[PDB]
From Swiss-Prot, chain B:
Protein task: Attaches the virion to the cell membrane by interacting with host receptor, initiating the infection. The major receptor is host ACE2. When S2/S2' has been cleaved, binding to the receptor triggers direct fusion at the cell membrane. When S2/S2' has not been cleaved, binding to the receptor results in internalization of the virus by endocytosis using host TFRC and GRM2 and leading to fusion of the virion membrane with the host endosomal membrane. Alternatively, may use NRP1/NRP2 and integrin as entry receptors.
Region entry Integrin-binding motif, spans: 6-8
Mutagenesis / variant outcome for changing residue 8 to N: In strain: Omicron/BA.2, Omicron/BA.2.12.1, Omicron/BA.2.75, Omicron/BA.4, Omicron/BA.5, Omicron/BQ.1.1, Omicron/XBB.1.5, Omicron/EG.5.1; complete loss of interaction with host integrins
Subunit structure: Binds to host ACE2. RBD also interacts with the N-linked glycan on 'Asn-90' of ACE2. Cleavage of S generates a polybasic C-terminal sequence on S1 that binds to host Neuropilin-1 (NRP1) and Neuropilin-2 (NRP2) receptors. Interacts with host integrin alpha-5/beta-1 (ITGA5:ITGB1) and with ACE2 in complex with integrin alpha-5/beta-1 (ITGA5:ITGB1). May interact via cytoplasmic c-terminus with M protein. May interact (via N-terminus) with host bilirubin and biliverdin, thereby preventing antibody binding to the SARS-CoV-2 spike NTD via an allosteric mechanism.
Highest taxon in the source lineage: Viruses
Protein name as catalogued: Spike protein S1
Region of the whole protein represented: 398 to 444 of 1273
Length: 50, 47
């Protein structure tokens, strides 16, 4: 979607291996706030919004 | 310590930095004292 009207996906009721994202060479940045990307598999959430 | 790396991966060469080379094959100490010098060597080391 275009940045004037950006699209929010709710993620819920599932397991995510964040290493599948963070280990990828595909990303030009992966900057995180309040959490470090290496820790995200050890930790869990009510929902995630993309 | 002397070696060739891909230019994008030079980020991993520090105390506190994270990635596959920092995890596996070239861990620096968390309190490392010294200097990291890196430069593009495409004209020397590509084929």
């Amino acid at each position: 979607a275009s940045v004037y009207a950006w699209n929010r996906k709710r993620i819920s009721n599932c397991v995510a291996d964040y290493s599948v994202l963070y280990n990828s060479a595909s990303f030009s940045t992966f900057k995180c706030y309040g959490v470090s990307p290496t820790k995200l598999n050890d930790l869990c959430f009510t929902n995630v919004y993309a | 310590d002397s070696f060739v790396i891909r230019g994008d991966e030079v980020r991993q060469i520090a105390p506190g930095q994270t990635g596959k080379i920092a995890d596996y094959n070239y861990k620096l100490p968390d309190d490392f004292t010294g200097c990291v010098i890196a430069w593009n060597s495409n004209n020397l080391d590509s084929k």
